[PDB]
Design a protein around this ligand. Structure first.
Ligand SMILES: CCCCCCCCCCCCCCCCCC(=O)OC[C@H](CO[C@@H]1O[C@H](CO[C@H]2O[C@H](CO)[C@H](O)[C@H](O)[C@H]2O)[C@H](O)[C@H](O)[C@H]1O)OC(=O)CCCCCCCCCCCCCCCCC
Ligand SMILES: CCCCCCCCCCCCCCCCCC(=O)OC[C@H](CO[C@@H]1O[C@H](CO[C@H]2O[C@H](CO)[C@H](O)[C@H](O)[C@H]2O)[C@H](O)[C@H](O)[C@H]1O)OC(=O)CCCCCCCCCCCCCCCCC
Ligand code: CLA
Ligand code: CLA
Ligand code: CLA
Ligand SMILES: CCCCCCCCCCCCCCCCCC(=O)OC[C@H](CO[C@@H]1O[C@H](CO)[C@H](O)[C@H](O)[C@H]1O)OC(=O)CCCCCCCCCCCCCCCCC
Ligand SMILES: CCCCCCCCCCCCCCCCCC(=O)OC[C@H](CO[C@@H]1O[C@H](CO)[C@H](O)[C@H](O)[C@H]1O)OC(=O)CCCCCCCCCCCCCCCCC
Ligand SMILES: CCCCCCCCCCCCCCCC(=O)OC[C@H](COP(=O)(O)OC[C@@H](O)CO)OC(=O)CCCCCCCCCCCCCCC
Ligand SMILES: CC1=C(/C=C/C(C)=C/C=C/C(C)=C/C=C/C=C(C)/C=C/C=C(C)/C=C/C2=C(C)CCCC2(C)C)C(C)(C)CCC1
Ligand SMILES: CC1=C(/C=C/C(C)=C/C=C/C(C)=C/C=C/C=C(C)/C=C/C=C(C)/C=C/C2=C(C)CCCC2(C)C)C(C)(C)CCC1
Ligand SMILES: CC1=C(/C=C/C(C)=C/C=C/C(C)=C/C=C/C=C(C)/C=C/C=C(C)/C=C/C2=C(C)CCCC2(C)C)C(C)(C)CCC1
Ligand code: OEX
Ligand SMILES: [Fe+2]
Lengths: 334, 52, 35, 136, 341, 451, 37
């Protein structure tokens, strides 16, 4: 009867086209502002002093870029970790010079993605679902907050944060290799196993369902039209695909349970990306990966090279060349 | 002035009257239904289905 | 620049207050089980 | 393959050469990394990269520093590179060992093995010792 | 009846491990690729080929051990044990790097023999052969990297060695010298690998969260007998969920599980096309409109020109120790350093 | 066996301690046994940290994390961060070891011989999760203890010995907190700051008067709010917003313990007041400034004017100006211009680094400190070799800050996942559909057309 | 190291922090011996 109850009834209605919910009250204003500023800053945005040395790096399309090289540049080294909104900038020209829109996009992104995650919970509550799709979405939220939030914190500047682009991503990955040795760190190892394993069990499960489909169509029409939507009959012989994989490797390595099978597809990647995103986090605070340089010696004591020493000389090439003007002192403490 | 240690970033006095009239303008909406109810009615559930 | 700043704290604590007083609005009872 | 010709290092300013027993080269590495190696790792100096532990750089000091007797001289009394004034107040030493807690327990044979490690390491690794990151 | 029928009936007999006709190609060749790797990473060194240490005898752990590629002087020889290089000696065969071609060749006939295994079991069980066609994805990555990439290059030396950190340098060797991340075929491959990991994390978490009540226990894993005809999760609910969260959603289980096949496999085929184009050094190295402008205007900087200076560090610093056969003796004064690093 | 198989409960062996939700004696014995393990570790770790103590190396080079908390309390510490005694550290690790054998016996008694439910025999200790008067009493009793435990810091810092102030005039030493700060505009000044750079929400407490003065207000709140929740009952709005069940209270804690998990992991990276650099090693920001100060001293001895020394980029090579106007150090160290450290604050002014004081008054203990904090920067590896990621294997050092900021930070994300799991289940266990969708009554079928 | 009346037990103390890991493994050993029921 009241105005608030007629507003709570609408905002929590599943009869809307898109469910809004109470998290959409701060998902939609956040992500539309992260979007509408990203499209403008990617297309039309002046160059940005990223190294704090007043050498402005172009990143937008109107200043001679493309899809690959164009990128929303991170904020300045001069700012660093300080909060830099528009009203604390004394003009928009001073805001866009010093890496303004990187903080406006990222902070409205991480609020909107952490609200998109809670929104996946909310609709599962109002639909009668068991709730935990949003726990599986915690794994890219862990990884998005690792390269945009946690790594600028432990390194003390948003300038070490990830550039919102495509070539800026590979500037981020290579400089992160030289300074932290991520490939030898066992948490990037535990998530390469998460996505190689994840793409394995995806294409391994998706093939054994498509292999054992039941005849419901003719050879002229499509294979997919043998599934009517909302039917109650099972659309594939699960005993058939169990007997196949029960002979392809051996018998006891096969899940006859389809529920425990469809749980292992959700376990393996998500655990692999939780562990990986806490690799960037523990390497944000300079707890680097393994270092086996000069580890094998002869009885005389001369250093015998290994593959890690060849990997070290690739890291030394990126270390002596990243931010080639920003350094003045012999050790990259930042 | 960015790195000042001021509460909620309230630099000027005018920003307070923005905050108080934001929480209260929806609080007064909320009290139009969930306010003025019996504050002495209990349940032995995990969850209450009392009224609107 | 102190006119924009006023506009943001309106918009933030408008939607934050809809969030805060959304879950205070007997939100566990809004399920498909009963009521 | 630690031959005694390779363990034979120069010991005095005149140029006599004596050999290091195999416990000297082993304690010489453990003590150097624990005491000196925080800044003098691999022969370079972190806090002053001009003055290294190179056998070229030890020889060009105004007292010649290549000898074992010259290095243990430096530890008990560190002068500068031109040897005019003392920097015992800032370099860890025996004379100024009340400030540095790391050097309150060192014997004569312990400095004899640390200086043994500084001298015998350019003979093992010819270019890695104090060559910087180019020769890692 | 005949002699062929007795052999055909014996191989296809139900037993512990299904042998079949294809097991005569798989089980000898896969056993020797795997055992050739465990031996080569334990005992055989890389001291004469690369000038490294890549064994457990030489102090390397699991990470820094490898079965390494042979010398550049060998060229593309197959390095047969009886060949003109090894000449029957086992010990000189291992020091030249003969185990690496032993692993790669008997491994390539393991992936032939394992994909034939998936056609044979599908014909006996009587199903469609999409496992054997999705496994053709990983065949196109082994062939076009461990085989077709060193063939276009100077020798077998520029191939990935079969060891954990030896793959890791091959990742770094391919950025500095080839600019591999800029190649659109890797970009369509990352979209399939991160896209394939995405689909199993969603389909894992949506089936498990729209389950029906089939029991009174709190454990839902117990409430599934395998031979039941009732579906175990509400497809109508899961469609209604994602149609409001994400906006668009699958309404077809046959199209869904096919789409979980197409996305991971295509990322292995599109990325396999590009690595064949790097055997020929047809790399996507530069945007010339970016390069002509940065030469004429010494103020124009992008992130893209920042990656070239990172590649000069990879091309100069590691190439001295990368290729000891070529004898790069760089002075200290040609190596590109930055300011004060 | 009844109550300890899936036929009676419905929980498998792997989710086996979920059988303890609706028994109270077995659940009490479980919480006092895990409390017996928290104690037992801390006693046995400090004895492990005493038996490997060497007076030669500093306190942070030896890789300890627990005997540096007691040195902040002031036991066995001397002036300048020099640990003297290490007989009182032995004494603390025995009391936290003997006592776990008593808390161990409560965990083995109450969970193997105690009654399954306390509500039958012991009406004071027995409870129900759905009850709301008892649960605020359990919250109230265990809040007055957290009030009293906060005053033990205050009693110890004002009366019993004192605490280690690294800002203490004359050098870092055990200092009695005479006059703590009791201003709520200052103490709650911290709690309502920005969490970003320069403000640094609650990490940025920069003297021991605000620390010890702050733990007073915590003891005031936790006792008045402890008495508040004993007497009262949850209000009308608080009964409508929560789920009053067993697992829901567990997912309330896991959200809040993750807040404390990140914050203790960010104290250890930035704060050099509660965590003195003499004990925990230099911070991330502090070792970046100690490098630029060392080469400032180095090239000042070569007769170089360091103020007018034009850098290679055109900025200051040594001294430049911050974006708020202050004289700072230049390089990549310009990001850490908020670094307030007891060896650089002698060189401050109103404006910043006083150029007259740099040209004339640099004391050799600052040179011995900046050279110590350059070589022991918090940059390590998992095999515990120091330096940069491309450093050779000779040193054995990873800073104890980097172990605390990478492990309590590591856990504090997984306990945020524990807030997501255990509250998704508890909100759905209250509503009835945690076991799945009913086949007879599906809620989606009784809705509108889909669009 | 430990005080002089306690230098004898320096091997036993080195094992002691490991012992809380052994309680995590003690649960699974107990679940194996009960037959996971
Ligand atoms: C699909 C599913 C596949 C299933 C997997 C099956 C795996 C089976 C394994 C295949 C075995 C192939 C390896 C054979 C060795 C190799 O190749 O050995 C290479 C030799 C060629 O030898 C090389 O030949 C070169 C040409 O030299 C000549 O030219 C020089 C300058 O002119 C000098 O004059 C020199 O004297 C003269 O010989 C250089 O000499 C090299 O050093 C020498 O090694 O060819 C040969 O054996 C044969 C080459 C001709 C056949 C071409 C097909 C194979 C090559 C495909 C790749 C083509 C490259 C495209 C790149 C993409
Ligand atoms: C939220 C979850 C959803 C995620 C969305 C994120 C967008 C939310 C909106 C933005 C809020 C960002 C948090 C900023 C945290 C930060 O910059 O925190 C930094 C501050 C530390 O402040 C530092 O404090 C320092 C204080 O030091 C000063 O004071 C000290 C006094 O001793 C020393 O003297 C020191 O030398 C001196 O400089 C300096 O001031 C630094 O400039 C200042 O940055 O920490 C503190 O606020 C305390 C720690 C806060 C917890 C941080 C948690 C990080 C969240 C990661 C979550 C990952 C999982 C995501 C899942 C979803
Ligand atoms: C923090 C660790 C911890 C603790 C304290 C508990 C505690 C408990 N669990 Mg449990 N559990 C744990 C971890 C833990 N669990 C883990 C990790 C798993 C997964 C494998 C399980 C799986 C599990 C299942 C499946 C079940 C329990 C059950 C129980 C309860 C009763 C056990 C019982 O009566 O059987 C008798 C127990 C034994 C015979 C074990 C004897 C081992 C002794 C006590 C070891 C003592 C060693 C110690 C050093 C001695 C100190 C003595 C002192 C004087 C110094 C008890 C409260 C049961 C339950 O729910 O009860 C209703 C049950 O069904 N647990
Ligand atoms: C939080 C922990 C906790 C809780 C709630 C309980 C609760 C209970 N225990 Mg139990 N117990 C515990 C820990 C705990 N115990 C520990 C650690 C041990 C090992 C020593 C035991 C050993 C034990 C035995 C052997 C028995 C009980 C019994 C009981 C029941 C009746 C107790 C009674 O007579 O009350 C009134 C008791 C008192 C007023 C005496 C209190 C004296 C203590 C020393 C005061 C505590 C001082 C202070 C608050 C603690 C400060 C240290 C702190 C910072 C850690 C009751 C349910 C009895 C039972 O269930 O009957 C079958 C029983 O026989 N307990
Ligand atoms: C371990 C810590 C702890 C825990 C878990 C709880 C748990 C609880 N407290 Mg409690 N409390 C504690 C410590 C704790 N208390 C302490 C130390 C104090 C003393 C300051 C209080 C004072 C207190 C009060 C006064 C009330 C509760 C209430 C509650 C219930 C939940 C409400 C809530 O979280 O809203 C979280 C809400 C916020 C963080 C913001 C609320 C903003 C308020 C409502 C604006 C109105 C102004 C109001 C007069 C306060 C002025 C301060 C400022 C906001 C203007 C719950 C039983 C409520 C209840 O049901 O009472 C029984 C209640 O009214 N607590
Ligand atoms: C677990 C994950 C980690 C959780 C985060 C950890 C807590 C971080 C510390 C938070 C600090 C809180 C202090 C008060 C806020 C503060 O001062 O910010 C105020 C700061 C200060 O703001 C700036 O201050 C400067 C002064 O130095 C200048 O004056 C600037 O003009 C002014 O903008 O601004 C912000 O950070 C705004 C934050 C907006 C985010 C609001 C979204 C929250 C919505 C969540 C829903 C609400 C439910 C949660 C509430 C219950
Ligand atoms: C019954 C049938 C059983 C079937 C067996 C099937 C054979 C397959 C086994 C594959 C094992 C391959 C791993 C080799 C590891 C090795 O031996 O390292 C053995 C090496 C040897 O250890 C090294 O020894 C050297 C000696 O000079 C030096 O001392 C090094 O310091 C020391 O590290 O150990 C390690 O490197 C330590 C870490 C070991 C990590 C291994 C696990 C890594 C994850 C791989 C998991 C493989 C899963 C196999 C599943 C089966
Ligand atoms: C604020 C949040 C609100 C939600 C935001 C909305 C954004 C949603 C994006 C719409 C996807 C549209 C693609 C049409 C696709 C289409 O319409 O498919 C429709 C298809 C429905 O299939 P049915 O089961 O109806 O098909 C049965 C048979 O008829 C098969 O033909 O749905 C899906 O399979 C889509 C699932 C994968 C979704 C693919 C999305 C890929 C992400 C987008 C990549 C492009 C981004 C480029 C940016 C430069
Ligand atoms: C080369 C060659 C040869 C040979 C072959 C063969 C016969 C081989 C085999 C071999 C083999 C076949 C090997 C094997 C090996 C194995 C190993 C050595 C293993 C190990 C293991 C491990 C170490 C693992 C670990 C673990 C465990 C135990 C448990 C837990 C988990 C883990 C994983 C950790 C010939 C004569 C033809 C001649 C030519 C050449
Ligand atoms: C219930 C249960 C459980 C649990 C258990 C527990 C958790 C327990 C705890 C336990 C405990 C927690 C224990 C503790 C103990 C301790 C002790 C027993 C101690 C003693 C001490 C001593 C003996 C010492 C000595 C010494 C001295 C005096 C001096 C110096 C030297 C030394 C250190 C040697 C489980 C899981 C199985 C499961 C089932 C059920
Ligand atoms: C010791 C010390 C101190 C002090 C401290 C303080 C004084 C504290 C405070 C604290 C506080 C004062 C805190 C607060 C917190 C709060 C929170 C964190 C809240 C939360 C809330 C919630 C969680 C809510 C939720 C919700 C919503 C939103 C809606 C509806 C439903 C519910 C209700 C659930 C200082 C700083 C001086 C310094 C250092 C030392
Ligand atoms: O900003 Mn971006 O990258 Ca991280 O390391 Mn230091 O800071 Mn700068 O150099 Mn390297
Ligand atoms: Fe599936």
């Amino acid at each position: 009867v009241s105005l608030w109850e007629r507003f709570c009834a609408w905002i929590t209605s599943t009869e809307n086209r898109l469910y809004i919910g109470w998290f959409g009250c701060l998902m939609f204003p956040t992500l539309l502002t992260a979007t509408s500023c990203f499209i403008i800053a990617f297309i039309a945005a002046p160059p940005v002093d990223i190294d704090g040395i007043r050498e402005p790096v172009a990143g937008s399309l109107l200043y001679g870029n493309n899809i690959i090289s164009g990128a929303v540049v991170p904020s300045s080294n001069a700012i660093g970790m300080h909060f830099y909104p528009i009203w604390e900038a004394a003009s928009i020209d001073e805001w866009l010079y010093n890496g303004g829109p990187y903080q406006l996009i990222v902070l409205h992104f991480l609020l909107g993605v952490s609200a998109y995650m809670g929104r996946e919970w909310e609709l599962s509550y109002r639909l009668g679902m068991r709730p935990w799709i949003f726990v599986a979405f915690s794994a890219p939220v862990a990884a998005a907050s690792a390269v945009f939030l946690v790594y600028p914190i432990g390194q003390g500047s948003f300038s070490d944060g990830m550039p919102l682009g495509i070539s800026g991503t590979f500037n981020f990955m290579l400089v992160f290799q030289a300074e932290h040795n991520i490939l030898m760190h066992p948490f990037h190892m535990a998530g390469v196993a998460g996505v190689f394993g994840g793409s394995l069990f995806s294409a391994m499960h998706g093939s054994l369902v498509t292999s054992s489909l039941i005849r419901e169509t003719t050879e002229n029409e499509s294979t997919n039209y043998g599934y009517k939507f909302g039917q109650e009959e099972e659309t594939y012989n699960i005993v058939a695909a169990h007997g196949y994989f029960g002979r392809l490797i051996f018998q006891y390595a096969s899940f006859n349970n389809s529920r425990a099978l469809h749980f292992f597809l959700a376990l393996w990647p998500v655990v692999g990306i939780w562990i990986t995103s806490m690799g960037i986090s523990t390497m944000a605070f300079n707890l680097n990966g393994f270092n086996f340089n000069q580890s094998v010696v002869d009885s005389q004591g001369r250093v015998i090279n290994t593959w890690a020493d060849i990997l070290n000389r690739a890291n030394l090439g990126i270390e002596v060349m990243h931010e080639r003007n920003a350094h003045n002192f012999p050790l990259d403490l930042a | 002035t960015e790195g000042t240690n001021e509460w909620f970033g309230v630099d000027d006095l005018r920003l307070l009257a923005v905050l108080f009239l934001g929480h209260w303008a929806i609080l007064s909406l909320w009290l139009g239904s969930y306010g003025d109810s019996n504050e002495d009615e209990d349940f032995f559930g995990e969850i209450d289905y009392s009224a609107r | 620049m102190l006119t924009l700043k006023i506009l943001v704290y309106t918009t933030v604590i408008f939607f934050v207050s809809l969030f805060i007083f959304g879950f205070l609005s007997s939100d566990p009872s809004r399920n498909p089980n009963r009521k | 393959d630690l031959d005694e010709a390779t363990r034979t290092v120069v010991v005095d300013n005149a140029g006599n050469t004596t050999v290091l027993t195999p416990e000297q080269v082993k304690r010489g590495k453990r003590l150097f990394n624990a005491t000196c190696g925080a800044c003098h790792v691999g022969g370079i100096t972190k806090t002053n990269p001009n003055v290294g532990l190179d056998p070229e750089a030890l020889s060009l000091a105004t007292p010649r520093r290549d000898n074992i007797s010259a290095l243990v001289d430096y530890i008990k009394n560190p002068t500068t590179y031109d040897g005019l004034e003392s920097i015992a107040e800032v370099h860890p030493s025996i004379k100024s060992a009340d400030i540095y807690p790391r050097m309150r327990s060192l014997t004569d044979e312990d400095l004899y093995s640390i200086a043994g490690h500084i001298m015998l390491s350019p003979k093992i690794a010819s270019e890695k010792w104090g060559g910087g990151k180019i020769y890692y | 009846r005949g002699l062929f029928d007795l052999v055909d009936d014996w191989l296809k007999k139900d037993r512990f491990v299904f042998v079949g006709w294809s097991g005569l190609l798989l089980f000898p060749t896969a056993y020797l690729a795997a055992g050739g790797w465990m031996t080569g990473t334990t005992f055989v060194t890389s001291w004469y080929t690369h000038g490294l240490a890549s064994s457990y005898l030489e102090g390397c752990n699991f990470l820094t051990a490898a079965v390494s590629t042979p010398a550049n002087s060998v060229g593309h020889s197959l390095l047969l044990l009886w060949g003109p290089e090894a000449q029957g000696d086992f010990t000189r065969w291992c020091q030249i790097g003969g185990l690496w071609t032993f692993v790669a060749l008997h491994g390539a006939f393991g992936l032939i023999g394992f994909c034939l295994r998936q056609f044979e079991i599908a014909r006996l069980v009587g199903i469609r052969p999409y496992n054997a066609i999705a496994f053709s994805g990983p065949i196109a990555v082994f062939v076009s990297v461990f085989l077709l990439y060193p063939l276009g290059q100077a020798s077998w030396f520029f191939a990935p060695s079969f060891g954990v950190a030896a793959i890791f340098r091959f990742l770094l060797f391919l950025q500095g010298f080839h600019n591999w991340t800029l190649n659109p075929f890797h970009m369509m491959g990352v979209a399939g690998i991160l896209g394939g990991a995405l689909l199993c994390a969603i389909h894992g978490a949506t089936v498990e969260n729209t389950l029906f009540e089939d029991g009174d226990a709190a454990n839902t894993f117990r409430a599934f007998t395998p031979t039941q005809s009732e579906e175990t999760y509400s497809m109508v609910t899961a469609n209604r969920f994602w149609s409001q969260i994400f906006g668009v959603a699958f309404s077809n289980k046959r199209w869904l599980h096919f789409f979980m096949l197409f996305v991971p496999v295509t990322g292995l085929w599109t990325s396999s096309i590009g690595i064949v184009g790097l055997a020929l050094n047809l790399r996507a190295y530069d945007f010339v409109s970016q390069e002509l402008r940065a030469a004429e205007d010494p103020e124009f900087e992008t992130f893209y020109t920042k990656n070239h200076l990172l590649d000069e560090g990879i091309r100069a610093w590691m190439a001295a120790q990368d290729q000891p056969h070529e004898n790069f003796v760089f002075p200290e004064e040609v190596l590109p350093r930055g300011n004060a690093l | 066996i009844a109550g300890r198989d899936i036929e009676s409960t419905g929980f498998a062996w792997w989710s086996g301690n979920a059988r303890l939700i609706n028994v109270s004696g077995k659940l009490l014995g479980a919480h006092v046994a895990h409390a017996g393990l928290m104690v037992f570790w801390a006693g046995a770790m400090v004895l492990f940290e005493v038996s490997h103590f060497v007076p030669e190396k500093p306190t942070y080079e030896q890789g300890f994390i627990l005997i540096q908390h007691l040195a902040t309390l002031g036991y066995g510490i001397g002036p300048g961060g020099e640990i003297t005694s290490t007989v009182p550290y032995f004494a603390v690790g025995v009391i936290h070891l003997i006592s776990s054998a008593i808390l161990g016996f409560g965990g083995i008694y109450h969970s193997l011989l105690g009654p399954d439910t306390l509500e039958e025999s012991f009406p004071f200790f027995g409870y129900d999760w759905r009850d709301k008067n008892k649960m605020t009493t359990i919250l109230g009793i265990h809040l007055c203890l957290l009030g009293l435990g906060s005053f033990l810091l205050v009693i110890k810092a004002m009366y019993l010995g004192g605490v280690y102030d690294t800002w203490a005039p004359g050098g870092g030493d055990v200092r009695y907190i005479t006059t703590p700060t009791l201003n709520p505009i200052v103490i709650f000044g911290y709690v309502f700051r920005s969490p970003f750079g320069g403000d640094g929400w609650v990490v940025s407490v920069n003297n021991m008067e605000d620390v010890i003065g702050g733990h007073i207000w915590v003891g005031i709140l936790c006792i008045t709010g402890g008495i508040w929740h004993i007497f009262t009952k949850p209000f009308a709005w608080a009964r409508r917003a929560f789920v009053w069940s067993g697992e829901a209270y567990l997912s309330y804690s896991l959200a809040a313990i993750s807040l404390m998990g990140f914050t203790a992991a960010l104290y250890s990276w930035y704060n050099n007041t509660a965590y003195p650099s003499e004990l925990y090693g230099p911070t991330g920001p502090e070792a970046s400034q100690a490098q630029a100060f060392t080469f400032l001293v180095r090239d000042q001895r070569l007769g170089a004017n360091v103020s007018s020394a034009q850098g290679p980029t055109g900025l200051g090579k040594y001294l430049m100006r911050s974006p708020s106007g202050e004289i700072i150090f230049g390089g990549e160290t310009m990001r850490f211009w908020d670094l307030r450290a007891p060896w650089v604050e002698p060189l401050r002014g109103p404006n910043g680094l006083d150029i007259n004081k740099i040209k004339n008054d640099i004391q050799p203990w600052q040179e011995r400190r900046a050279a110590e904090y350059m070589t022991h920067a918090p940059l390590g590896s998992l095999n515990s070799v120091g330096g940069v990621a491309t450093e050779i294997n000779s040193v054995n050092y990873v800073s104890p800050r980097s172990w605390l900021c990478c492990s309590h930070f590591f856990l504090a994300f997984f306990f945020l996942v524990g807030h997501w799991w255990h509250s998704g289940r508890a909100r759905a266990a209250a509503a009835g559909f945690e076991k799945g969708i009913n086949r007879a009554n599906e809620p989606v079928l009784s809705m509108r057309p889909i669009d | 190291r430990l005080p002089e009346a306690y230098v004898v037990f320096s091997p036993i103390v080195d094992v002691l922090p490991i012992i809380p890991v052994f309680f995590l493994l003690l649960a699974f050993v107990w679940q194996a011996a009960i037959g996971f029921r």
